[PDB]
Paper text:
The cryo-EM structures of T = 9, T = 9 Q = 12, T = 13, T = 16, and T = 19 shell assemblies were determined at 2.3-, 2.99-, 2.93-, 2.75-, and 3.04-Å resolution, respectively. T represents the area of a triangular facet within an icosahedral shell, whereas Q denotes the area of an elongated face within a prolate shell. Consistent with the T = 9 mini-shell, all the shell assemblies produced from the midi-shell construct exhibit additional densities at the shell inner surfaces. Although the quantities varied, intercapsomere assembly interfaces of each shell can be divided into two categories: pentamer-hexamer interfaces and hexamer-hexamer interfaces. The angles between capsomeres in these interfaces vary slightly among all shells (α-angle: 29.4° to 31.5°; β-angle: 0°). The structural conservation of pentamer-hexamer interfaces and the variety of hexamer-hexamer interfaces indicate that the change in the shell size is more likely driven by the variations in hexamer-hexamer interactions than at pentamer-hexamer interfaces (see detailed discussions below).
Author numbering:
A (entry chain A6): 703 to 736, 770 to 869
B (entry chain A5): 770 to 814
C (entry chain Y), D (entry chain e), E (entry chain j), F (entry chain 7), G (entry chain 5), H (entry chain A1), ...: 6 to 97
The structure:
Amino acid sequence: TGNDIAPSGRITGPGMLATGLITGTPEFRHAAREKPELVCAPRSDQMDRVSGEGKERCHITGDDWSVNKHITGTAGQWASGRNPSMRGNARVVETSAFANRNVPKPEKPGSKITGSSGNDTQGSLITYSGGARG
Amino acid sequence: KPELVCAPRSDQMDRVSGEGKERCHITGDDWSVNKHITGTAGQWA
Amino acid sequence: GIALGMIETRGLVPAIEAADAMTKAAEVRLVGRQFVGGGYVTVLVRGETGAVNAAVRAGADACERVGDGLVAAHIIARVHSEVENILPKAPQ
Amino acid sequence: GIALGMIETRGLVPAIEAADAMTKAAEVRLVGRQFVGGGYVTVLVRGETGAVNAAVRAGADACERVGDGLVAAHIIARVHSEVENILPKAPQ
Amino acid sequence: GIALGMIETRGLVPAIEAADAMTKAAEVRLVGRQFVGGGYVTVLVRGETGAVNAAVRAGADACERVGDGLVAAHIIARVHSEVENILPKAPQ
Amino acid sequence: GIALGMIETRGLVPAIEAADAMTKAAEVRLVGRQFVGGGYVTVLVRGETGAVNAAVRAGADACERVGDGLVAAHIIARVHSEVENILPKAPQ
Amino acid sequence: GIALGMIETRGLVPAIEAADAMTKAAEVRLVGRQFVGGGYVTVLVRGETGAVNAAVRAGADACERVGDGLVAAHIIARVHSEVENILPKAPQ
Amino acid sequence: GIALGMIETRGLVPAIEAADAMTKAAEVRLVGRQFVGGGYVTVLVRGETGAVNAAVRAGADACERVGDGLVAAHIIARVHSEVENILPKAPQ
Amino acid sequence: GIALGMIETRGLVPAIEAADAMTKAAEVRLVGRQFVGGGYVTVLVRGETGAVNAAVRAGADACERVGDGLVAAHIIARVHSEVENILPKAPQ
Amino acid sequence: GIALGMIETRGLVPAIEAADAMTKAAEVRLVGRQFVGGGYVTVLVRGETGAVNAAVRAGADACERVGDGLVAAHIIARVHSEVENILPKAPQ
Amino acid sequence: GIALGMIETRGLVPAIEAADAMTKAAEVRLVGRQFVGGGYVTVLVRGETGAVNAAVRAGADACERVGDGLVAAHIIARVHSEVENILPKAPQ
Amino acid sequence: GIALGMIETRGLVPAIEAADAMTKAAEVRLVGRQFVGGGYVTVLVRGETGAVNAAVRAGADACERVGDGLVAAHIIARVHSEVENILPKAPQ
Amino acid sequence: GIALGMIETRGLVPAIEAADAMTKAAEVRLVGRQFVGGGYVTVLVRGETGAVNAAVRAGADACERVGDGLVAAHIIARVHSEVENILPKAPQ
Amino acid sequence: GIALGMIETRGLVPAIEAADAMTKAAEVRLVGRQFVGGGYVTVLVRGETGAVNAAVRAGADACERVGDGLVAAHIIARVHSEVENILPKAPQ
């Protein structure tokens, strides 16, 4: 109670702008409270957990450092669960050269130039000052 | 968001052809005037 | 200023109407009126880049329903030195 | 500058908001506040055509829903020499 | 502070009640009262943005039912230098 | 003041627009801008809680539809002393 | 001048092409080319409100079709003094 | 700061939780913790209107369910000078 | 340590039982007992966050069924500096 | 150089736009602007083959959409001495 | 302290919120703020195991709804003595 | 004069292939490779307009299918004086 | 040992988890932590071929579900003398 | 050897495996690993065309499946003198 200063629609001013896009406001802090054919398995079909000099695609018989299921030890539960963790929900938006390989782009420039031009429409899009096709 | 900042070339043709162009949407304090601002152009010219 | 505002029309009546609307509308000066030939008549003004934009828009609106109408409205905010050789220096 | 931009509103509060928006948006000079009478309050700004165009547009948006309302937003890129007498030069 | 709080009303009785509630409500400094004409009366206060928000809310809901009523209640967190000429610094 | 207002945007064009809107809107001081990396720009302003609220809302509104757009708009009314080690001290 | 014009592009080739178009289109001063990171490259020009409005328009049109394209084209007619602490003065 | 923010709780433990939440949320200075008697513990903070609003809101939420809980959360933007005689100046 | 663990009970008998259990359970030092009034007695301990966690849990368990019963058990890992004014430094 | 770049347009407005773009986009010399009758205007520039090639590309793009449009855009890498007689030596 | 608390976010605004929350909640010393690149910003805190558990829990919950949000929150009660060579000792 | 030709690619390997092809095709001086950020790489060459035209055309063909790909290929026959300040003078 | 074991991850938090797990899993010394850019972080260890295999497998499982996740896991039994130059010798 | 062989991968781990395969496959010297940005990493080896051709063929195969993968594998039998400025000379 008391001298409320919460944003309201009756009182115009800056306080009413950007409703819903703002966080950390007293209003939002409160809301949060609430025999296989081949020795080595197919290269394409299988992906190895550790790729180099630790690959299990090739069936190396005899003595080897592979540990079966009945043998407990260092890996698995004994390494995964040592430290508590929390996986959050984030907006993973990739802004990079590869991500922009397919972007909505304007119409390709066209050259109506004639004469001693030496132009080639086949070649990759060369551009000239102004964006004119070169 | 708009897919392209400037409207497609052959889709439209600007009233004033160069440097008075309107195809490219430019946010900020540009010199565009909407219906609310009467004035220099229109029936007044 | 240096910006150039060009309005092109078919015939002379629309051009004179456009030169009158352009100069009255904004702070610009009528550098010239060239008879292109085949009907087209071009009126050129000079002024601040913002003033020229206002004048040409007013000029285009004025002369688009006078005679055979408007052909081309243009603004060039900075005109290269070479082009100034082919522009009317001052009205005849 | 020479370009003139006017925003007329019903009451003073819309006009003060319009003036703040106009003088914040672009380089314009608040030349006058005129109590027309009957609730009409006019704010006049002067500057370059581009600056005034942005200033008046920003002012119209700001005071559209503020108080009684906006009456008119008007831009004149170049006022006649005669009209310069009726226009205010600097505010009271 | 520099923020500005405005309340516009139809008459002088609502304006004084709004001015009384505004000053009592929060740490605001009543600066001006304006007779806009046509019944509009404006009361302007200055202070910190938080203080102004409290005062205008108190003034708006205190002067709403007295007299013809409340026309405009508005806040400006920062006021441009040009507008300071059109606002009344002295208490009356 | 000590309240911290933060706006995170994609690209610099939205961020500079937010900085202009934020500083213009309320009585806050720009303490710096940081290129987070991967097309993230964070603009920070420090001031009183009332001003920072008004500033951030103005910045969020201004830059919402500019360039790629707005990512975040946060207000920490009091930042622990430790966080001041990572916050920028003055703009560069 | 004081007005600021800004263009944001994906990559540097459209950024340089935009910068050339802006400076060739109108009498503006290129004050910075900033690598925002993540691809975005921002070119900033400063001049008169009319000149910058023309310069940015030419920059956007030329840069649109070059490379990945154009992200933003923005004018700020008046730049608040606090926001100039985060704006390059001479290009790097 | 002149605004007053008070939280009243049934039992001391919620009061200390309220004081902790209030003093962490915003820039509010704790002025006193009064044992009213009958199991009521009132914590008073003095700060700017924005800080007081933010702190009290945080205080009420934090101690809403801690122990017996909350009795009252009140914000006064300005207390009459006579009331300040019955308010703690420094905590005890 | 800085973490604060406090138990509030109805009557002194549960408070003494809680005080005994708290000190027996973990490495936490008793810092005070407050007679809140209305038959509320609050015992506070200070220690490391883990130690205080164990102490409060053991304290609440011991005094839950003792006498009138238990009102509140609360842990604050870090207590703001201002709140340190109202906490007892050492028991009386 | 001796390379001749020629752009023919319907009306003077596209011709001046073509000439402006051509001389701004390369190191060419504007030698003539010849009215042909029928509304055709032709702007002729001379320079090195590389410069003329870039200019005519820039000119054709700039004036394609301006006014009535473009008629021709041709490049002659080396001009026979006989043709030099019919070409204009200096702009008029 | 020896326990390490790390929170990773997809911006800097969620990182600053997370740091504020962690530092306020428990007794943790902020040791680093790293721009991993690609947008990710990681905040590392050091303290006793009990304090770190509360700090990370507070930080993880605070920044979840701010900006792009939380990528990871991790607690390593003791880090191998080799890992301490790649950890910051104090933010720059 | 001296022209500018630039090839923007995704990754360094395409850029070096463009830099190799461009310099082998004509007498163009490689002035700089820029890591724009986000995976864009730009290579810039200076030389006569004809030399730059042949170089860029050869570079665009060579690096089209190499690696992630080609983003942009640009040739600027005349580079404004202002834009020179943002271009590398020589490679490092 | 000279065998090299590398784990790559998205973000710093998964990388540190993997490094701690690898150092704790077997007899491997942590040599480097690299920010590859774009969110990738790589952690490198040296040691016996058998030990490195055990460590990397533990680290791969440890950081698989931490943060964005595991990118790559690699073991090189013998590193060519040339490659030793581009590998970190010890962590900064 | 003049010939240059470059492999581009997404992440450092594939690059390191590519470097080892390339150096072990033939007689090539690793001149440097570069972090292009956005996750791109490039390893450049130099040697005789025969050694470079065999090494890059082995390198692309070895790292094709490691981590995110391979982006580019290129062979330049002769590198121009100008391009040698932008290439690494010795690894760091």
